[PDB]
Ligand SMILES: Cc1cc2nc3c(=O)[nH]c(=O)nc-3n(C[C@H](O)[C@H](O)[C@H](O)COP(=O)(O)OP(=O)(O)OC[C@H]3O[C@@H](n4cnc5c(N)ncnc54)[C@H](O)[C@@H]3O)c2cc1C
């Protein structure tokens with residue numbers, strides 16, 4: 346299991362936080378997962394599952410057995426003409442899996458290109474970008490129940506997907522996702538509702554655009570605008586876009602005409618969290634080794650040497666400010682440990 350004791354978790358989380366783990370193992374299959382669980386239980390330790398550590402905020406030393414999911418495997422399950430069921434192990438890296446799918450001529454994942462992390466973590470966070478969510482293509486997953494060790498399958502309804510949310514993120518220590526099945530397509534019409542994606546695609550003058558073509562535009566836009574943790578530690582968008590009811594939206598828009606929002610089918614309004622934080626004065630904020638990115642106001646950053654506690658406290662500060670100022674509470678996207 347390539348076990349290490351008292352090992353630093355710095356290279357395993359995109360914020361670059363330097364806490365240390367009491368044990369660190371690497372699981373390459375389901376037997377390893379079972380061995381790691383028994384080992385944690387035999388030794389009186391909790392078990393902390395990690396993938397690419399790109400949605401984790403570590404705030405203290407980890408008195409647990411940290412299990413890095415590193416199982417490999419990607420395959421086509423059934424090809425049903427336009428629809429195609431594909432399957433990947435939890436440890437498979439997400440963006441190489443998107444590229445694997447497009448190289449097979451399958452559409453569906455192109456708008457989720459270049460998101461960090463693993464296939465296993467993607468349903469838990471219901472990852473989303475440029476108008477697409479994982480739940481749009483989700484068929485099923487296999488998860489180990491950590492209350493009794495049994496395996497069960499979840500279809501889409503049983504996953505209780507929501508905005509950057511799922512049953513698994515609500516009960517975080519309960520299920521351990523082993524493999525994920527998605528339904529991809531061929532020859533479908535192509536999701537270009539986002540202005541800048543459509544504009545840059547059109548500028549390229551492809552006679553007949555495809556999913557691969559969309560994927561290369563999204564990669565270029567993401568590389569252009571989103572800080573890379575390689576250089577500046579972060580977990581992407583720290584906050585979710587909040588939803589408010591129609592009355593709250595009336596008082597806010599009647600007080601701020603410039604309010605950026607996305608109307609929903611049920612009459613509620615999803616506010617742009619980045620606009621709230623910018624309009625609150627936080628963009629470019631910096632206090633000691635932590636701050637808010639100068640152009641992407643949603644992105645909290647580790648300039649170097651931050652503890653996880655300092656990141657946590659800046660976020661709580663931004664939260665309190667935006668609550669006090671516009672009466673809106675910003676929820677975080679990252680998971681806190
Ligand atoms: C630069 C950057 C850009 C990003 N852009 C986006 C974006 O556009 N859209 C978006 O939605 N997200 C985005 N994210 C965050 C996104 O959630 C992660 O990139 C990714 O989904 C997390 O996967 P991971 O494997 O890194 O999970 P980790 O951070 O390792 O884990 C996160 C949580 O999920 C759990 N988890 C991981 N694997 C398993 C498993 N097999 N079983 C059970 N629990 C598990 C962990 O226990 C932890 O609670 C971004 C992050 C970064 C750093």
Ligand SMILES: Cc1c(C(=O)O)nnn1-c1ccccc1
Pocket residue numbers: 473474475476571572580581582641643644
């Ligand atoms: C573009 C984007 C989306 C989206 O397009 O919905 N979600 N997060 N995110 C993001 C934002 C800042 C940093 C990293 C990722």
